[PDB]
Design a protein around this nucleic acid. Structure first.
Ligand SMILES: NC(=O)c1ccc[n+]([C@@H]2C[C@H](COP(=O)(O)OP(=O)(O)OC[C@H]3O[C@@H](n4cnc5c(N)ncnc54)[C@H](O)[C@@H]3O)[C@@H](O)[C@H]2O)c1
Length: 209
DNA sequence: ATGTC
């Protein structure tokens, strides 16, 4: 019988530690189309233009790159591309943070969001704006440690939670890191912003490859 | 096993 979703429902954004100062200085994650002051790109360039044109067919609309993106799992396929040095970025997974919030925190804050049931660039992805539709997602595929096949699982593992334009830092509940050295560098950075929320910093090696 | 498609 099919796994239900966790409540609260965690959402996960991976970023390079060299971006954490910018996030704290702005007080928010910014969508790609808001030109975040990032220091490090961990993306594939060749899938960027698809996200700049992929229309979001739920209000508030626009395109995928109008939204701050999250997965419903850690240890994403995107992280595997980074871990394996397939990206232009060659720093590997160790400096990649998982920033963790929940879908309910976003709804409670009244921020406009949408979410998908699969990788968002796919033309057959479904989009939702009601948290009751989390039932439409495949929680087995989202939680799978082996995702490369079959193809439906690979697609559904990459269901996304999308928050329009910006995501306030105060909604982050945990920063998860690969190593004790990265956790210590994260706390150093949080201490430079003594008025910012300070989420717990947890080493979760099992969220990495 | 997995190099986001
Ligand atoms: N990052 C994720 O967890 C995630 C989740 C779901 C989908 N995706 C998509 C996969 C693909 C590559 O991802 P990503 O590299 O995140 O996207 P991107 O290529 O749009 O890069 C935006 C970068 O800016 C960073 N950032 C945002 N706000 C700030 C700020 N205020 N100061 C400094 N840096 C900031 C953000 O963390 C990310 O590293 C994009 O198309 C994403 O939309 C990513």
């Amino acid at each position: 019988m099919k796994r239900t979703y966790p409540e609260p429902t965690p959402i996960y954004h991976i970023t390079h530690i060299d971006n954490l100062k910018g996030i704290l200085r702005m007080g928010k994650l910014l969508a790609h189309n808001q030109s975040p002051p990032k220091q490090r790109s961990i993306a594939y360039a060749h899938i960027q233009e698809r996200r700049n044109r992929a229309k979001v067919p739920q209000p508030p609309g626009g395109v995928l790159h109008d939204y701050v993106p999250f997965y419903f799992c850690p240890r994403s396929p995107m992280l595997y591309a980074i871990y394996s040095g397939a990206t232009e970025y060659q720093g590997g997974q160790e400096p990649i943070l998982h920033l963790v919030s929940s879908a309910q925190a976003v709804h409670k804050a009244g921020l406009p969001f949408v979410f998908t049931d699969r990788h968002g660039v796919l033309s057959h992805a479904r989009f939702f704006r009601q948290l009751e539709e989390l039932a439409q997602l495949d929680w087995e595929a989202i939680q799978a440690s082996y995702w490369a096949d079959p193809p439906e699982l690979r697609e559904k593992k990459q269901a996304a939670f999308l928050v329009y334009k910006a995501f306030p830092w105060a909604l982050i509940e945990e920063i998860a890191v690969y190593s004790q050295r990265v956790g210590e560098e994260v706390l150093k950075i949080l201490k430079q912003f003594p008025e910012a929320r300070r989420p717990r910093v947890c080493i979760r090696k099992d969220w990495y490859y």
